[PDB]
Amino acid sequence: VQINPTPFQQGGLICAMVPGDQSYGSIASLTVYPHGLLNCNINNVVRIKVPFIYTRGAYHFKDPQYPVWELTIRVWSELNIGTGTSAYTSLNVLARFTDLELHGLTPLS
């Protein structure tokens, strides 16, 4: 995840890797997930490694049971500026696969 603050802005963001559901689990308990914490003070690019979390053996693309992973962005601390300071920041989410396995070839699309 790549964001970019100017250091006259303050605030914080959080990105969490959430499997299954955004159910009745707490927002203030989301540090138990493998997550990332963003700040307007120290750094602006973090990267997260997460495994395959799923009930069955493999994942079906043409008809999935449920999504394996899911990311959310909650406002971890509000964006406060002064006069003339930029009232925004940029945000990017990059993703790739690791240790890929492919099975079950199909002739159809």
Partner 1 sequence: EQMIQSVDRTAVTGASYFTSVDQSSVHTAEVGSHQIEPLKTSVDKPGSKKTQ
Partner 2 sequence: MMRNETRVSTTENVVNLSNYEDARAKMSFALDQEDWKSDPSQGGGIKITHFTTWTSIPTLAAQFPFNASDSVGQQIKVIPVDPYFFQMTNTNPDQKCITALASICQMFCFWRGDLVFDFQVFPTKYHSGRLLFCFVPGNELIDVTGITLKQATTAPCAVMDIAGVQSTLRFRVPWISDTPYRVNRYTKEAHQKGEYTAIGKLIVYCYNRLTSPSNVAHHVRVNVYLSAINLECFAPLYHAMDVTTQ
Partner 3 sequence: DDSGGFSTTVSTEQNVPDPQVGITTMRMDVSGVQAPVGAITTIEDPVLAKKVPETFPELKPGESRHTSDHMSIYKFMGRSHFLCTFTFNSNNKEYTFPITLSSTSNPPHGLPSTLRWFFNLFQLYRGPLDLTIIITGATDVDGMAWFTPVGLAVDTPWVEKESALQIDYKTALGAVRFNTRRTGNIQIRLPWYSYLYAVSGALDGLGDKTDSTFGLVSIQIANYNHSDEYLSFSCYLSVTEQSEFYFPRAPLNSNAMLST
Binding site for partner 3 (CB under 8 A): 19-21, 23-26, 29-37, 39, 42-43, 45-51, 53, 55-57, 65-66, 98
Answer left, alpha or beta for residue 107, where phi above 0 means left and psi between -120 and 50 means alpha.
alpha
User: What is the C-alpha separation between 24 and 30, in angstroms, rounded?
Assistant: 12
Cα distances (Å, whole numbers) of residue 40 to 16, 33, 52: 18, 22, 31
Closer to partner 3 by Cβ: residue 48 or 79: 48
Q: Does 82 bind partner 2 (CB under 8 A)?
A: yes
- Name the residues that contact partner 2, by CB under 8 A: 7-12, 22, 24, 26-29, 31-32, 39-42, 51-60, 62-63, 65, 76-78, 80-85, 103-108
